Design a protein around this ligand. Structure first.
Ligand SMILES: Nc1nc2c(ncn2[C@@H]2O[C@H](COP(=O)(O)OP(=O)(O)OP(=O)(O)O)[C@@H](O)[C@H]2O)c(=O)[nH]1
Ligand SMILES: [Mg+2]
Lengths: 1027, 171
């Protein structure tokens, strides 16, 4: 049968097989295990004629020790034997036969970890290296018995490295062992026992072999590097016994610094730098202070390091230079707190000043590195994080320990820092990137770099303030005309890039501010006659750009994006000084008019046109959000312009329609100085426009994709209008409304103009059409419109505030006709908004009504086997428990439906369903909004279903994974916190249904009470998984 | 046409089966039934230089269901490692899968995919990922529910497996 076994093994690994590889691999899984599966691996490895894939399948079939106590010895013996065969055949050869050896090594690692494990056979296998290495010195099977835990002389260890492949195999074997132990540690937390036997036999010989490779010429083998990292990663996960590595680090430093261009082409240099970068980025304290200071001297300095960097830049080895930069920054970022201390606080008077100021000078000098960013060097890129951490350290220092020159020196340093970074993030850099690489990932990295620098500038504001940062940017930008020509096109590319980067960082600094707490912004802009002119000229220059190339197109987008966001953030300034706003508004709408009447159809210049258009409209809406009172003179004009573009036959975009309606609504919202009637006139005009456009579209054409998109646009316009008319929650100067509050409260409560009825009759006409009610997008926007007025501050005279009935009628009119699986979440979220709004008026009868009509009648044919909707229903019940628990406790479906159904969903296999039902039961147990009667009844009810419940929990943990264990703990723990007496009454009956260790947890889960479960739980799950 | 063996590995969950099912039929599976061993499925992509098909070996992430495990990696020509950005423990096992792959196929191209980006309670940020050091290894944020970076890991693979950074997958 072995020949046919080999046949379908080969057929498994064939490029064009028949007989279905799925069934082939299933049949191969059937062979292992079996009566002969072990013997099959035997005969598969011992026969020379079998191919490499076939021998490796044999080695794999030996791995089935997971399928009583002495067959383990049989498999161990076979691993050692076939190991020795295939490793003797290795030296007198060249290549191809190493992966089967690696597999045998991995399985010997698993054996190593099974024998040296708790829970008269044999208990010891101390040094697999010694065991391995005595088996080339070789009545026959009797050898393996004594060779097992046999000691090896360090001289005979070195004799084995007579050839190079012997050294390779010896290093690879320890590598494999610790790599598999690392894999086992990541998955499983029951090896604190074997880390000591590894510490006590394998560690010593491994360190000996590695150190011999590092110190002895003619025996060195680069595999040692792959070995070292392994043993580093293994030691890092144990604890950050103590395994040293300090001498290995010393010899790696020495071997690195012996690597030059003439010695070996810096190969060992880059290898040891990868090793040190691993150490520095993941566990840097693993290297002691003395060795770190040797590293510091080497990295910072004819000096070695410099001669390496030049080697990288002349040969254009920019990727290796990048990874070098990453390593150096991770190193420098170890001692940021001590550098911050040794600089700015006083806790060798100045011969350590002579050292650390030179340190800072060469760090600044390295940051400025004379190559273009991201395209050539990441030195400036990678340690924006260093300077960020250093500035955070400085700002967080104790105020009573700073040196007297701390402010001045920090200002000097962190101001030369921005002097460095501003040219680095110039759009000229991005221009060159796309000129030499196109729209690659280097531009994404460049955007990440500018955002990192912007965060750095925000951080530096707290050190530099406005005097030494923001005022510098505004003054340098506002004292000279960037384009004195009244065309306002910045004619010189260099001044254009410079002023754009300045706008970028100025924007970033200005967003952290609320430009109303201080007259600073008005005072500084009043001192700079050319500031607004230069902002507007940046906008015009970018937006009148003749986009000849795609480079120019993407740069045009960048310039207009910077300028527009800067205008939107200067909105607050505009409110303090409104007579400067009119040029911005005129420029924005002139550019919008340019966008719209632009009809040239390259089809890929119109996407850029629409991007420009949406930027423009976003910023006019952000200006209207803050300057709504100052923009009143434009209102009548806006409404007119809206009328000429609200039509479908316009080259405007739907998003700009919506944002234009929102900005108009912002301006209308503050028109309260007269009565409510004059404002309602504007609102009525807008609602009539929008609803009539919707109805005209619905009645004039068949609803193809164009008409559907237009209906969607108009529904979002209604939503934007509703949002813009919400009163701002923050108190504003001269409310005027506050004198008229009552007469608005009386006006919109009556709504003589029937705004609410018009709007929802429009929504109904949309969603009474079969084409749309099945569309979750339009269901969503309708529910949002109906829910704007819900949960607003009490007494707010909001125009579109629907009462409870009006809302449910809506959902009641449209859930029977929608596509449930996609649309019902929006209706349910609206009902949750409803029950939050009307929580004090609601009765359990009304809760049952809306729970029956909306959820229960659809539960079996639509919800029970749909994880999203099921999580939805669970969240609905949880929300009612958060808000008013008596609605669910007093429900006629509480014991009937909710408790039994949520009881069955506990052993769900979808993680968010698990966490939802766990949240449900935990809050049921721990809800603090209970009165005492509700608490008594809830304890009665949970005591009734407690056995079934604790069964469903334990049933879940039996089959679920480690990631979703915690979601059960919080649940289970809750029980023992509140029902500790029933708990074990419930545990002793459900645990045998799904022995000693079980009782163990029963004695140690209840003993803990709470907070430190899970740790008690997984040690149970790790027990009851193996069996 | 030309054919390439892909092996799809990663911890249980994370969404390997739903990933290949969205690529194969456009369906999105909401429920989680763990795979038993492997499932092999052909995925043909159309592009210049004719079509190319990846036969995808969707492996089981749960070791209890591992099946042949390492045996599926033999004769593999490319690999995709996948983790769940909402479950950080899946990201911590990535080097485990990586060494399990390269210990039998070391110089093959491997794409690392952070699935489920659509869930905005994301617990793994792109700056944390550092496994884009080498050239035979690439990272992508993908979402089998959102089609975000839908067929990009297959594009990068294809490009390296045939040897041209310009294919773009025409429809
Ligand atoms: N939100 C979100 N969920 C996803 C996404 N992809 C998959 N899922 C969910 O995650 C679960 C993953 O299931 P599977 O695809 O079978 O996971 P698997 O990789 O096959 O795991 P194993 O079979 O054990 O190897 C499914 O229930 C999906 O609903 C995604 O992109 N976004
Ligand atoms: Mg699967």
């Amino acid at each position: 049968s072995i020949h046919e076994v080999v046949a379908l093994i080969e057929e498994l690994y064939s490029p064009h097989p028949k007989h279905d590889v799925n069934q082939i691999q299933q049949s191969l899984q059937s062979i292992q295990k079996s009566e002969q599966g072990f013997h099959l691996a035997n005969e598969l490895l011992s026969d020379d004629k079998y191919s490499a894939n076939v021998k490796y399948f044999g080695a794999l079939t030996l791995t089935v020790q997971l399928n009583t106590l002495w067959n383990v010895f049989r498999s161990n013996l076979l691993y050692l034997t076939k190991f020795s065969t295939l490793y003797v055949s290795n030296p007198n050869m060249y290549g191809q036969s190493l992966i089967i050896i690696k597999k045998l090594m991995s399985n010997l690692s698993l054996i190593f970890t099974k024998i040296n494990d708790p829970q008269n056979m044999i208990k010891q296998w101390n040094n697999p290296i010694n065991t391995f290495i005595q088996l080339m010195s070789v009545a026959d099977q009797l050898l393996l018995d004594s060779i097992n835990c046999s000691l090896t002389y360090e001289q005979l260890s070195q004799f084995v490295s007579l050839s190079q492949k012997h050294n390779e195999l010896a290093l690879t074997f320890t590598e494999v062992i610790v790599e598999d132990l690392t894999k086992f540690q990541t998955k499983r937390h029951s090896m604190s026992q074997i880390h000591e036997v590894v510490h006590e036999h394998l560690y010593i010989s491994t360190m000996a072999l590695i150190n011999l490779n590092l110190t002895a010429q003619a025996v060195f083998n680069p595999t040692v590097f792959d070995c070292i990292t392994a043993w580093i990663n293994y030691i890092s996960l144990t604890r950050s016994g103590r395994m040293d590595l300090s001498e290995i680090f010393q010899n790696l430093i020495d071997l690195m610094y012996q690597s030059t261009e003439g010695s070996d082409g810096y190969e060992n240099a880059e290898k040891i730098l990868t090793i040190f970068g691993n150490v520095f980025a993941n566990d840097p304290l693993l290297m002691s202070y003395d060795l770190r200071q040797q590293i510091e001297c080497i990295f910072l300095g004819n000096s070695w390091m410099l001669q390496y960097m030049n080697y990288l830049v002349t040969n254009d080895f920019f990727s290796e230079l990048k990874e070098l930069a990453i390593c150096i920054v991770d190193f420098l970022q170890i001692n940021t707190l001590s550098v911050c201390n040794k600089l700015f606080t006083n806790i060798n008077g100045q011969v350590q000043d002579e050292y650390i100021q030179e340190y800072i000078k060469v760090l600044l000098q390295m940051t400025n590195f004379p190559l273009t960013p991201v395209l050539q060097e990441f030195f400036s890129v990678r340690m924006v994080d260093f300077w960020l951490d250093l500035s955070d350290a400085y700002t967080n220092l104790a105020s009573e320990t700073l040196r007297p020159n701390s402010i001045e020196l920090s200002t000097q340093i962190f101001q030369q820092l921005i002097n460095i970074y501003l040219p680095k993030i110039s759009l000229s850099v991005k221009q060159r990137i796309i000129e030499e690489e196109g729209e690659s990932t280097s531009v994404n990295e460049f955007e990440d770099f500018r955002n990192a620098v912007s965060d750095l500038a925000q951080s530096l504001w707290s050190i530099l303030g406005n005097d030494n940062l923001t005022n510098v940017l505004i003054d340098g930008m506002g004292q000279m005309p960037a384009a004195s020509d009244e065309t306002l096109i910045i004619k010189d590319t260099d001044v254009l890039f410079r002023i754009e980067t300045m706008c970028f960082v100025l924007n970033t600094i200005l967003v952290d501010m609320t430009l109303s707490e201080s007259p600073w912004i008005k005072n500084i802009v009043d001192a700079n006659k050319f500031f607004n002119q230069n902002v507007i000229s940046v906008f015009q220059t970018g937006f009148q750009t003749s986009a000849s190339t795609k480079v120019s197109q993407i740069l045009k987008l960048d310039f207009v994006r910077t300028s527009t966001t800067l205008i939107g953030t200067l909105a607050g300034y505009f409110k303090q000084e409104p007579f400067q706003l009119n040029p911005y508004v005129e420029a924005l709408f002139q550019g919008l008019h340019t966008c719209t009447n632009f009809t040239s159809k390259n089809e890929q210049e119109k996407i850029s046109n629409d991007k420009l258009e949406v930027m423009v409209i976003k910023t006019v809406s952000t200006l209207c959000e803050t300057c709504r009172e100052e923009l009143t003179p434009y209102l009548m004009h806006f409404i007119s312009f809206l009328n000429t573009v609200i039509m479908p036959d316009s080259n405007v975009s739907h998003f700009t329609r919506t944002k234009l309606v929102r900005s108009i609504g912002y301006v209308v919202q503050c028109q309260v100085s007269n009565g409510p009637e004059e404002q309602a006139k504007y609102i009525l005009q807008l609602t009539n426009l929008l609803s009539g456009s919707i109805e005209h579209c619905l009645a004039s054409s068949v609803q193809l994709q164009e008409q559907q998109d237009y209906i969607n646009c108009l529904l979002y316009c209604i939503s934007e209008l509703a949002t813009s008319l919400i009163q701002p929650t923050e108190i504003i100067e001269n409310d005027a409304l506050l004198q008229r509050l009552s007469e608005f409260q009386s006006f919109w409560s009556s709504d003589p103009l029937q705004i609410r009825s018009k709007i929802m009759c429009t929504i109904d006409k949309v969603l009474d059409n079969s084409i749309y009610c099945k569309n979750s997008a339009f269901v969503e926007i309708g529910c949002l419109i109906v829910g704007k007025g819900l949960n607003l501050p009490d007494g707010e005279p909001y125009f579109l505030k629907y009462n409870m009935s009006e809302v449910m009628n809506f959902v009641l009119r449209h859930v029977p006709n929608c596509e449930l699986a996609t649309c019902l979440p929006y209706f349910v979220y609206l009902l949750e908004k409803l029950i939050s709004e009307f929580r004090k008026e609601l009765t359990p009868q009304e809760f049952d009504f809306m729970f029956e009509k909306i959820l229960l009648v659809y539960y079996d044919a639509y919800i029970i086997n749909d994880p999203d909707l099921l999580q939805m229903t669970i969240g609905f019940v949880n929300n009612v428990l958060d808000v008013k628990p008596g609605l669910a406790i007093g429900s006629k479906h509480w014991t009937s439906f909710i408790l039994p159904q949520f009881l069955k969903l506990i052993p769900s296999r979808e993680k968010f369903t698990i966490v939802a039902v766990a949240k449900f039961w935990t809050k049921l147990i721990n809800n603090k909004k209970y009165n005492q009667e509700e608490l008594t009844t809830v304890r009665q009810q949970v005591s009734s279903i407690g056995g079934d419940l604790v069964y469903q929990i334990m049933y879940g943990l039996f089959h679920t994974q480690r990631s979703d264990l915690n979601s059960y703990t919080d649940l289970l723990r809750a029980l023992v916190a509140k029902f500790p007496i029933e708990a074990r009454e419930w545990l002793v009956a459900v645990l045998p249904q799904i022995a000693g260790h079980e009782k163990f947890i029963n004695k140690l889960l209840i003993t803990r009470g709470s907070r430190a479960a899970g740790n008690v739980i997984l040690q149970w799950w790790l027990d009851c998984t193996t069996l | 046409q030309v054919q390439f063996k892909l092996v799809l590995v990663g911890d249980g969950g994370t969404g390997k089966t739903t990933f290949v099912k969205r690529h194969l039929t456009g369906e999105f599976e909401k429920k989680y039934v763990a795979t038993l061993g492997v499932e092999v499925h052909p995925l043909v992509f159309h592009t210049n230089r004719g079509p190319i098909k990846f036969n995808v070996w969707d492996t089981a992430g749960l070791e209890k269901f591992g099946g042949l495990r390492d045996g599926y990696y033999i004769q593999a020509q490319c690999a995709i490692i996948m983790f769940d950005v909402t479950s950080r423990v899946t990201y911590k096992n990535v080097p485990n899968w990586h060494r399990d792959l390269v210990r039998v196929c070391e110089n093959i191209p491997i794409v690392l995919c952070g699935n489920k980006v659509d869930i905005k309670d994301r617990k793994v940020k792109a700056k944390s990922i550092v496994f884009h050091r080498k050239k035979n290894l690439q990272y992508y944020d993908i979402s089998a529910k959102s089609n975000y970076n839908f067929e990009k890991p297959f594009l990068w693979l294809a490009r390296k497996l045939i040897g041209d950074p310009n294919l773009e997958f025409v429809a």
